């Protein structure tokens, strides 16, 4: 019973590492994607306000 | 409606006042926190002799007046001149009569007990407001971001603060104050820009260095290999056109200015910087609450608006915090008004009615009543 | 040795589930964040082109 | 079913309450035996003013409350605060109304006559339970291991005991109490771990030393040449990852902590240790019953769960007992709930119905009735 | 004379080193326990490039160096920087060559075995002293007050301790350490004095708050009706003249600072205070020795010098101790050097010669020899 439970432990610990790495790479790609979404959505409100003032 | 419409929210700052009605999404009134006193006798065409000037008329006419700032580093230092800014806010800016409006005011982090009692004395006894309430600024900022536990890095015009808050109670012994903010930051840009070979000679040159700081300044992550980048000279440069043609270029200094917030040494300050201070606040708090504070670094204040401030802070504290920890730097877009918006929400709220200090409480308990 | 390895197995399997859920919630939040970043990056390339023509 | 379903079993401890329904295999409710009283006036968001807190809400909110333990060393010391823990158990934890449930309670080994009468007074007169019964703890532990004669080494959070039982009657004059248990043991680990060059500084560092003790601590047999082993430095070491990354390593101290149970001298205790005390209990009993007690050393309690406790005890008393004797140390896996399980069995039993003290017995005989 | 003259006594502290010759009445050398490392390359006029600075030259030149404290809370934390402070002590401060002087050193209460062996390794192997000896600090303080059994409340710059000693042997399991001392106390005064409406802005303002604490601070007995007294405003106030004219007044806060030692809650500390801790040490000791400890509360350390500390402690423990007991709080005048003086006495003593660890003992037994 012990040897079968050690083997299963090893396999689920390896899957847990393999997925924990995937989360961290997405979680980081996203602080990036959200930050470029926000740097983009500021530049505009300055350019669109700049548009409405130079149209006025 | 009696007071649903009727609650006022006045956030008193070192540089700006933000004011308006609880309910609104943003301040109806924003203006400098100055009180100008004319250096000479005379008049403007069509007006009478004016003893005093406040806000923008004091800024615009600054050449003939002696300008004074009532709030030094977030604390009210001159009460004669503050009652003047309040008067202006109610009567001219919001054009309301104060004696029928409940007023939510804000104070600073370790605001002396005696001050909270004094502005209550002036609110009730010289403005005769029905009821009032003083909220702590970081606490309204947090709450406006939905939560109740977190640590706010709050940074405006004269002060920076770190106020760790747990289930609403700001933690007195863990609060840190760093007297370097947006005011200090405009004057440093000034020098690195004259030092770029320029001259902000007339007052129309002075004022706009501040509009350069706001529009073009950045907080780079890896400020190290950003200077290095500056040198290879990429299309990192940025030219601004002055009141006239005089196109001034700012490439590099653009980020050397907010690197002052992480390195106070850029300005002859020996104090620690924003990120270390976030952290030190945190290793001054209870142990069990430190995972909470780390996942809830809420930013508020005009000077925390520099793009990429959050990414630099993100990486600044990850790399100081134990790896078992989750770091999370919340920086909302409306952050230059977080404080105010948190007050608008709270004061328009359904449950806040029972915390308003009324003239009944006051006339019966003395200023002590609201002081808590 | 068997009871300690069963307990560790149980705890790492529980962590593996708990993190696999976190990845899926981030991975989805991101198709959203990237898509709003792109719906944003088209309309201010349009509004800034509209700006440069009404400035000219 | 009337009461087959309906019998409650509440085991009151120095650290934990274990509670649930007679019939179940394990306690439905397990929680700290604390009652917190708020040090300041104020509220949590959305709740009202609370006068008191019990169990985990008292632990979680410990920074604003004064925590108090009603049971000192297994004996109820504060009856106002105990009625509070019972109230919480019935109404919030098990969510039952007590006035229709028979309640089996437990008491400690030489529990003063007057207490057994007082908790009966409170069970019947303030909770109005239909019927109740007080079992002695070691006696339920034994019985849950099937037998009726044996000696229980019982060890939990504030007390250790040896209760020799013969055909069900616990032997008053042979019972030994040693006031060093799991609570004492977590605080000693604490020091040998700070002494390993560490800091359990915030409250999130304090609490988890106890989770280190539970998960990684061992009772080595031949604790002598285990220290010797430590030195050659084998892969005996064991690193635990804290709330954050901060991987702490514990090699050796891992077993220096339960060696405290055999050597009280590790903690400035001059009393004898667990194994000697097992033995002394035994040479205080009748002669003819000593072979029985020796082949039936039943262990129960959270602190007897340290792996290899049984092997060390096995060899500890073989080598003190006359060689003509059979030693036998029974340590079941569910032992942190033996006491409770013994109560669940007994109270769900077919023959126990005729020992329940009913309100009829009480209203007619006074607290004396159940006291026996 | 060989060594009658020749024995050195070095007491290593968290804030100060006290040093001199066994025989003298007071330390020949007292100086900060810092090691400064220059932040920039350059020189003072007439000197060469200096890699390092120690004691007062590190304090005086602090603006261009990174200051570091080798002893954190009484324990040596950096051995590179400690060997630097020792070097400075022998060669510059006492101007002796160490290789012909026996050296009595002191260590802290539960100083890790390994440290006592390490400073022995450095004393004998890098300084080549003839012989040395490490005394425990509370133990030298007691002995300098004539006696051998008592309990010392020892409080300096980074730690407070209670060390119950019986016929010379400090009692390991009854010792209590409270990490709040004179350093913590100067920083709290700082805030209650800026909070009185002040500014300790330049470094010449910072340093002198500590000289205010030493000269004007008090420990009032009945700290209750001393605040009450403050309010009626008696001639309790006290103005100090700064480096310049700037006469600062301190009335009240004067005693609010040492009330921190009885109430750690003044500074966000949840630990118990000095008097309770004296007591708890005492109800952790053997029963038969508790009358002795109570009549012999010896005080030592810079922070126990606040006038009226003894009267407050006198009444603090009388009212916690059983009335059958005799309380007696000994606080001598030289107490900021008790530790040192106890070493001077002991090491100049006629009978101590046979406990000196000699290089013969060391070269033959390893660091283990002195470790005891």
Author numbering:
A (entry chain B), C (entry chain A): 112 to 167
B (entry chain K), D (entry chain M), E (entry chain L): 1 to 372
What does the paper behind this entry write?
Myosin heads consist of a motor domain (MD), which has the catalytic and actin binding functions, and a lever arm that amplifies small structural changes within the MD to produce filament sliding. The lever arm consists of a small folded domain, dubbed the converter, a long α-helical peptide that binds the two light chains, an essential light chain, ELC, and a regulatory light chain, RLC. Insect flight muscle (IFM) possesses a highly ordered paracrystalline arrangement of myosin and actin filaments that provides detailed X-ray diffraction patterns and electron micrographs. Here we report on further investigations into the HST state of IFM using a 2 ms duration stretch (str-HST) or release (rls-HST) and their effect on both the structure and distribution of cross-bridges as they adjust to the mechanical perturbation.
